[PDB]
Amino acid sequence: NPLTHSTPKNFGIGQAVQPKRNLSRYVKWPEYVRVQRQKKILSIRLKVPPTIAQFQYTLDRNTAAETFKLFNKYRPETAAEKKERLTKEAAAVAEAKSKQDASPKPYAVKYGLNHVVALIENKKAKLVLIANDVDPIELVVFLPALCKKMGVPYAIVKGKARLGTLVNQKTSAVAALTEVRAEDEAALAKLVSTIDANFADKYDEVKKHWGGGILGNKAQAKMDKRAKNSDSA
């Protein structure tokens, strides 16, 4: 009110230099960004075969949370723990003298692709966590088949790095379980059953659904209101 004035401003074609805006939608990203994006695009514009796309169907936050809970209850030995164990049988066994069984039967998540696969074939694993972001996809796409063939419950989990966390690695293609302490025993079938509702039992019906082919909005909007006009006269 005092010596101050309200002057607005007219940013309307042919007057007044444009005001800074958020041109985020327009910026010229480095090609390493364009290529990781247009791949995702190119990934879905095409009709993708149903031996892929039986992936992309990934577990849900809820069930996975408890499946990550139950699996974190079976981390492998850390560097220290094994040293701790090491000098617990270096000290013992050499004096106490127990047939290498001065140590309890271990219970942890099995991992490493090559390991897990042989376990699936040997009918010994009970739960398979297949990552869904293995980039050479061919590494893991034959595990949905192998399981259903071998009659093992499997679950395409979201998070190949997250999978790594519960096993002391940066990443892991797969997580697994052959053993479960008598405590968690009954708790297992709950998470196995829930899983087999979204995966192991669906499979055959998902093996024939060709995924993707999805249009982007600028030409989805095009169709959307094209099949609106020339029909509802």
Binding site: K20, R21, N22, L23, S24, Y26, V27, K28, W29, P30
Partner: protein, 121 residues
Amino acid sequence: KALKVRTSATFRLPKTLKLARAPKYASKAVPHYNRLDSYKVIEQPITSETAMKKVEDGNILVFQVSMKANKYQIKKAVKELYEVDVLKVNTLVRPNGTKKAYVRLTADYDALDIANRIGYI
């Protein structure tokens, strides 16, 4: 959470921390000693009949000088080596690949005397 706001459409190189060199072992093992001390700068006096007649009426000190060294290096060298202030230094490259300094000693000093000190008469 949220993205980022960009008031420009030009992705420029993300400014990054420039870490400097921490040599886990030496460059050379011993730094090269001075390559142009005053003993190397001025090489010999120049004692021509015309160069003396420069020292008579001129208060000038002619020297054969290292061609690796410029006006400054000749001033500092004449000074330090001959105990003199210097008015100006004129140089030239004589036809045999040698620097001829035409040093002029400030009014105070006498180049005439300064000759029979260093020892050429």
